[PDB]
Amino acid sequence: TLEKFVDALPIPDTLKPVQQSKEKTYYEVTMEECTHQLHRDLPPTRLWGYNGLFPGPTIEVKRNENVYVKWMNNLPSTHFLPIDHTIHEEPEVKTVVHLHGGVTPDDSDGYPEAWFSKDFEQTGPYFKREVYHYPNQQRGAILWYHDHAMALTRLNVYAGLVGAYIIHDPKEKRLKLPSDEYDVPLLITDRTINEDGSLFYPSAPENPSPSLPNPSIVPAFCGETILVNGKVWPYLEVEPRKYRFRVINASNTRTYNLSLDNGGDFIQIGSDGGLLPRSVKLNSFSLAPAERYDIIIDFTAYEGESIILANSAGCGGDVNPETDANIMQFRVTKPLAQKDESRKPKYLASYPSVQHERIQNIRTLKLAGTQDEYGRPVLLLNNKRWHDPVTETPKVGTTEIWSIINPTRGTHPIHLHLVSFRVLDRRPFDIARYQESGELSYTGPAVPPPPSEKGWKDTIQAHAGEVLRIAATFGPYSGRYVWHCHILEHEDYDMMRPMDITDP
Ligand SMILES: [Cu+]
Ligand SMILES: [Cu+]
Ligand SMILES: [Cu+]
Ligand SMILES: [Cu+]
């Protein structure tokens, strides 16, 4: 229904520090209930936002900048979305901020049980500090921050609690990539919106078996509408030149498969973990929840054109050409402000291969689940609940191969905190046999990663009927972290596990 391409794409302002010196940068971000218009033709929407903004302000830091952010909850004491009480005396509204892809001390990582309520009145069992510490001793990259509170993540994020966080490495400046105004984040979230403009989040699955509690969690969420940077199907006026985009899938469930309707190419220059070693010319790319693509789009040859960023991946069905087949629209009509001095270099960074690592351990992990007393699917990593004693206990400074078995019907974007990792390969196997006997026979050879996945990843798509192998060096910090599916509906029930990085 909503008319496509009638609102300009908002560019979230960069957060200004409360105090800053050479030794440290200090920010304050408070979560607020606020209203914002999401489309020219809608009444304002009630949202929860970092500093009352949706998306939250973009935070920009340098490699090794010593940063502190005091994340504060100043939200209402009751939620506005359907809470399922059967899945977890504590406050109804709990929040904790996770800097996804951050190389972070464990008590600044936004552990699900380090949640806090309004003004920190009550705090979860794993809470230690108000002011998070981000030393940012990691590669230049696109991070994003979002809520991570136990049993509430799918809800708090859907409410609007997402933002971008960029680490700039000054040594990457020589590459001369598009920058400043020509470097633009795109946070993509699908939403379903009611006529009065309020957010809709389902309080039960369709055909609620009379067994189900009310509200009941749902296995997956697909929105009828795509937003980018907080506007339904927006347009961006661009100059006819090279642009850099930080593409972030900030949606609960939905996977995008992006292309340009004029047949133009993306130049991939970066993955979750930063610059790829070599740029990759791409015609389409898959982007599952929490994945990030750092791309250049060359508008030089398309002056005057309107180009749709299009999507082909279904979400609980085929794309509707009028709705979710559309993400946004570029209009190459802005006059040049100056000569395009930016570059699209082939040679970007050292290969991850350059470093030789002793494999200390090899974990086999399965994506499984069971069914609760109401008949619902309960998703589990290794048939273990979140509350079960920890089993993933890598040693600090060591490298493991994780071997992720997926006998389910769907893809799972598996995310590991603290570390970025590389991809080894994927291999199809007999699902019926694995389920019958617990034994694994591969039905075809190993497939190494495409160039897209030959850098550093931290969220990785594990396709159905495959075994995915990744290699991660755990460090530099020890402590209590998490690994989980990043489909929020899965994560909350109950596809999330503790991870202890140990000291010897
Ligand atoms: Cu995340
Ligand atoms: Cu994360
Ligand atoms: Cu999942
Ligand atoms: Cu997480």
Binding residues for Cu cation: 98, 100, 146, 148, 412, 415, 417, 484-486, 490, 495
How far does residue 1's CA lie from ligand 1's centre (Å)?
31
**Do the Cβ atoms of 119 and 130 come closer than 8 Å?**
no
Q: How many residues does the chain have?
A: 504
Say how far apart CA 210 and CA 203 lie, in whole Å.
14
How far does residue 413's CA lie from ligand 3's centre (Å)?
6
What element of type H or E holds 482?
Answer: strand 479-485
Decide which of 2.120.10.70, 1.10.20.10, 2.60.40.420, 2.30.30.230 is the CATH code for 1-168: 2.60.40.420
Say how far apart CA 445 and CA 466 lie, in whole Å.
11
**Do the Cβ atoms of 469 and 402 come closer than 8 Å?**
yes
Decide which of 3.30.1370.10, 3.30.980.20, 2.60.40.420, 3.10.310.40 is the CATH code for 350-504: 2.60.40.420
Reported resolution, Å = 2.5
Q: Of the ligands numbered here, which is closest to the C-alpha atom of 250?
A: 1
How far does residue 415's CA lie from ligand 2's centre (Å)?
6
Nearest to 367 by CA among 286, 442, 431: 431
350 backbone dihedrals φ, ψ, rounded to 5°: -55, 150
Would you list the domain boundaries of the chain? 1-168, 169-349, 350-504
Residue spans of alpha helices (H) in 82-221: 153-158
Amino acid at 43: P
Domains 1-168 and 169-349 share a fold: yes
Q: Of the ligands numbered here, which is closest to the C-alpha atom of 251?
A: 1
**Residues 6+ positions from 454 with CB-CB distance below 8 Å:** 276, 277, 278, 351, 352, 422, 423
**Residues 6+ positions from 51 with CB-CB distance below 8 Å:** 15, 29, 30, 32, 57
How far does residue 386's CA lie from ligand 4's centre (Å)?
12
**Residues 6+ positions from 250 with CB-CB distance below 8 Å:** 55, 144, 146, 157, 162, 187, 188, 189, 289, 290
This entry's atomic model was obtained through: X-ray
Kindly list the protein residues that place their beta carbon closer than 5 angstroms to ligand 1, a single-atom ion: 100, 290
> 169-349 belongs to which homologous superfamily?
Cupredoxins -  blue copper proteins (2.60.40.420)
How far does residue 195's CA lie from ligand 4's centre (Å)?
33
Distances in whole angstroms, Cα of residue 338 to Cα of each of 138, 342, 348: 33, 11, 25
Q: Of the ligands numbered here, which is closest to the C-alpha atom of 491?
A: 3
How far does residue 306's CA lie from ligand 2's centre (Å)?
35
Distances in whole angstroms, Cα of residue 318 to Cα of each of 201, 256, 314, 405, 487: 21, 12, 4, 27, 19
Cα dihedral: 250, 253, 259, 265 (round 10): 50
How far does residue 206's CA lie from ligand 3's centre (Å)?
20
Residue 118, classed as helix, strand or coil, is helix
